[PDB]
């Protein structure tokens, strides 16, 4: 329908889907580079994670402060261009290093390989910052203005955005894997750069069309000084405790990451069962999104967080039982993980809506940058914990630690709900 193809909501969905497709393809490419030229060393993956996390921790407040002053179209297009240019310029380097692979591995002094590694990391670390900035500005500012007083429209928007993310997370790696299988990594990392170029152009035009469509988007109602001011202004926000609770859920190993997949591999599983496991995780995620939508419609915005916390903790009780009780253990563990996905996703959806609905119109970027900073602080702590404990039994301890941290986060959200209602 012409109406549902010109309204300024399908264009947001299309732009977001293109962006996430490119992002996930590029992430898969970097993972392949790591596993090929370094043998997926857990230490180097953890160092890469620490670099990204620390970089967003020290700089989230500054990026949010920058977003809060300038104009929306300007900042959106600048962030988009920086992201896509960085991704293209790194895909070219990945192509070159994939071509002359064995040369580097076997007939060059190690310092050139080290330099290539730190260069790829330093470019990915800027791509990640640009993606963070576009996330802040589009999700937390543009999505909230393109749907006005109505509160169900915003919820549907967030839900379908999360569904798009969930689908692409499993669709894009498969496509790039096929292209690298029936071709070569030198072709995959070139298809990625071409995709990102054409996508940058199309998304630029789509952003301009959106900005032309809604006139209510041009009316901006709005060293260390800004950093400290932002953090202290985030401390005393009415939703500080719910935001802290959401932050706490990133300290976890119960998911699909660099360590738990290696654990599964050690438990003698197959590729196909892992693929269908990821598919089941995506199915449960979509279930969680629709469950959040219905709950929010019926009971209320705030108690949905409590329901989701109870669900996640209920499944994590199986997750923690899985440690003490050679197939029952791993089956219960994976069942608990895939079931708790529902509560996890619906809880973070409702916390996101709490964030982007109460805070003042002239401080979205700064406190959302601080929220990203806290999420990445806990992610940095997670990676630190993984570094010191690589052994398999240590995983039997990390499960307990992760459930404890989830319990802490939901205790904090319960305190918030008691203060409010």
């Amino acid at each position, epitope marked *: 329908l012409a109406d549902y193809l010109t309204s300024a909501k399908f264009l947001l969905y299309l732009g977001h889907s293109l962006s996430t497709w490119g992002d996930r393809m590029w992430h898969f490419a970097v993972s392949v580079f790591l*596993v*090929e*030229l*370094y*043998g997926n*060393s857990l230490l180097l993956t953890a160092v890469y994670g620490l670099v990204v996390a620390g970089s967003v921790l020290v700089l989230g407040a500054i990026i949010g402060d920058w977003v809060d002053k300038n104009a929306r179209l300007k900042v959106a297009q600048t962030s988009l261009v920086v992201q896509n240019v960085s991704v293209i310029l790194c895909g070219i380097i990945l192509m070159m290093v994939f*071509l*002359h692979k*064995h*040369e580097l*591995l*076997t*007939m060059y002094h190690g310092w050139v390989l080290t330099s290539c590694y730190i260069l790829i990391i330093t470019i990915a670390n800027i791509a990640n910052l640009a993606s963070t900035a576009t996330a802040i500005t589009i999700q937390r500012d543009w999505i909230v203005v393109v749907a006005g007083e109505d509160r169900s429209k915003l919820a549907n928007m967030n839900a379908t955005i999360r569904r798009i993310d969930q689908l692409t997370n499993i669709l894009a790696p498969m496509a790039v894997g096929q292209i690298m299988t029936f071709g*070569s990594p030198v072709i995959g990392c070139g298809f990625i750069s071409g995709w990102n170029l054409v996508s940058m152009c199309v998304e630029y035009v789509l952003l301009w069309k959106v900005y032309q469509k809604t006139p209510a988007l041009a009316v901006k109602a709005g060293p260390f000084r800004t950093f400290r001011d932002g953090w202290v202004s985030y401390y005393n926000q009415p939703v500080f405790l719910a935001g802290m609770g959401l932050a706490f859920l990133y300290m976890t190993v119960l998911g699909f990451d660099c360590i738990t997949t290696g654990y599964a591999y050690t438990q003698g599983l197959s590729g196909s069962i892992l693929s269908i496991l990821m598919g089941a995780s995506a199915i449960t995620g979509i279930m969680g999104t629709v469950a959040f939508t219905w709950l929010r419609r019926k009971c209320g915005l705030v108690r949905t967080g409590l329901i989701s916390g109870l669900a996640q903790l209920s499944c994590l009780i199986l997750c923690v039982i899985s440690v003490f009780m050679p197939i029952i253990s791993v089956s219960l563990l994976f069942a608990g993980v895939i079931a708790a996905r529902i509560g996890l996703w619906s809880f973070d959806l409702t916390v996101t809506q709490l964030l982007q609905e109460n805070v003042i119109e002239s401080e979205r970027g700064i406190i959302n940058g601080v929220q990203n900073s806290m999420n990445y602080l806990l992610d940095l702590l997670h990676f630190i914990m993984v570094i010191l404990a690589p052994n398999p039994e240590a995983f039997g301890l990390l499960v307990l630690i992760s459930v404890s941290f989830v319990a802490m986060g939901h205790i904090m959200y319960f305190r918030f709900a008691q203060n409010t209602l």
Partner: antibody
Amino acid sequence: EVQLQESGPGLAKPSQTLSLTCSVTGSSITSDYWNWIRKFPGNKLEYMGYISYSGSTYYNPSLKSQISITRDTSKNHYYLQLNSVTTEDTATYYCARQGLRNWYFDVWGTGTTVTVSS
Amino acid sequence: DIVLTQSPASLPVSLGQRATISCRASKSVSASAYSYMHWYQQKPGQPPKPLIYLASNLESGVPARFSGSGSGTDFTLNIHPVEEEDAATYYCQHNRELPYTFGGGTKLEIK
């Protein structure tokens, strides 16, 4: 379809010069490494050196003879020149093309014998 | 420099059976996810031929009776089943660092 073919002289005298040509039909010499290998009378193969796809060059330091691995990019040829030959140069010389996709001597030539005497 | 010791000298076998030849290095010839140990087949009167590359792969067109396996410093090539034409010489060559080196050669025969 890649093909190599050697050429050169039959025999030589002590303290002379040998200029073995290798002609490559089906692919340029500006793609992957081009190596000179020699099998002695017997079984012990031996690596002599290579010329790269970018004018680089390398000689086996364990070799007791002066070798020069040159190339001519017009006729699509590359040359091995042995100087100051000796009674321990009699061997069978093969070309090979160390590729860049799988990193092994994947295409050889028929090879030519060389013997020194009086 | 890396020295590849090949064993045994000559390997007699009988048709239909399975034959195993192995050459051991003196250092590690394996980098991240890749091991540089290739196997060559040379009949009397012809240049060598590529059977296995990167110690576990198979060339385009070689009979599937040839299998490669190994890592670290010990490798192994298996033929099953042998034929009357497999009486040849088999070499193992590494690529880890210059200068490259070839094995001693296993003089397979048929009884």
